[PDB]
From a paper:
We examined the structure and function of a gene product with the locus tag CDR20291_0991 (cdPadR1) as part of our broader goal aimed at elucidating transcription regulatory mechanisms involved in virulence and antibiotic resistance of the recently emergent hypervirulent C. difficile strain R20291. cdPadR1 is genomically positioned near genes that are involved in stress response and virulence. We have determined the 1.9 Å resolution crystal structure of cdPadR1, which revealed that it is in the PadR-s2 subfamily of PadR transcriptional regulators with other structurally and functionally characterized PadR-like regulators from B. cereus (bcPadR1 and bcPadR2) and L. lactis (LmrR). We also demonstrate cdPadR1 binding to its own gene promoter in a manner conducive to autoregulation.
One molecule of cdPadR1 was present in the asymmetric unit and consists of an N-terminal winged helix-turn-helix (wHTH) domain (residues 6–80) and a single α-helical C-terminal domain (residues 81–106). The dimeric state of cdPadR1 is retained in solution as determined by size exclusion chromatography. The recognition helices (α3/ α3’) are positioned ~34 Å apart in cdPadR1, which is consistent with symmetrical binding to two “half-sites” comprised of inverted repeats ~10 bp apart; it is important to note that this distance does not account for DNA secondary structure. Dimerization of cdPadR1 buries approximately 1100 Å2 solvent-accessible surface area (16 %) of the approximately 7000 Å2 total solvent-accessible area per subunit. Residues on helices α1, α2, and α4 that interact to form the cdPadR1 dimer interface are conserved across structural homologues. In addition, LmrR contains fewer residues involved in dimerization at the C-terminus of the helix than cdPadR1 and bcPadRs. cdPadR1, like bcPadRs and ctPadR, has a closed dimeric interface, unlike the hydrophobic pore wherein aromatic drug-interaction occurs in LmrR. The P-P, I-I, and I-P distances between cdPadR1 W94 and W94′ are 5.4 Å, 9.2 Å, and 7.4 Å, respectively. The P-P distance is ~2 Å greater for the apo-LmrR (P-P = 6.9 Å), LmrR-H33342 (P-P = 7.2 Å), and LmrR-daunomycin (P-P = 7.4 Å) structures when compared to the distance between phenol centroids in cdPadR1. The lack of a drug-binding pocket in cdPadR1 suggests that any differential expression of the CD630 homologue (CD630_1154) during Mtz exposure would, most likely, be due to a regulatory cascade effect rather than direct interaction of cdPadR1 with Mtz.
Author numbering:
A (entry chain A), B (entry chain A): 10 to 40, 42 to 106
Amino acid sequence: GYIDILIVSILEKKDCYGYEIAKQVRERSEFLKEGTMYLALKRMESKNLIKSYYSNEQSSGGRRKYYNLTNEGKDFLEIKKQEWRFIKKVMNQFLG
Amino acid sequence: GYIDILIVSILEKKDCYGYEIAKQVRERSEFLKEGTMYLALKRMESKNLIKSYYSNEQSSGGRRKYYNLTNEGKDFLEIKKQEWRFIKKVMNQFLG
């Protein structure tokens, strides 16, 4: 359920397709089942936080489904970053 | 909604009454309306995370309603501490 946050964070600096997203979640955290990822990506498309498109069959990677962080998605991410700075301060004080 | 966590954290080392709880939430965080606190305390009593009792009219403070962290409450707190250590690591990596 934290997966939406991870995904918008990954997409901030580059449009990505599924493999790249999963790779970063593995490599940088301790989470991620592939099914879980595709469920999340569809949910975020639905909410217009991300926007999908396709690369060309004749491109280096062949046809992939890429995702773009939308303006709403960018807004969502900045809000999450703000909420995290706040929350992190409190919980460190009381659970640290 | 994070208030339940703050309250069990405060009660870990000492049984407290409302003023003391509110005081620590003020003094150590940036939160807390008194109504919000009494709503939370009743909810936690209901879930048997805390247990209330009363001091004597003739005591230094007169009659106060004190709260004790129960064994279930202690368990809840330890779980929250564990979840926080986990969450904090991930979110720092992706929202920091």
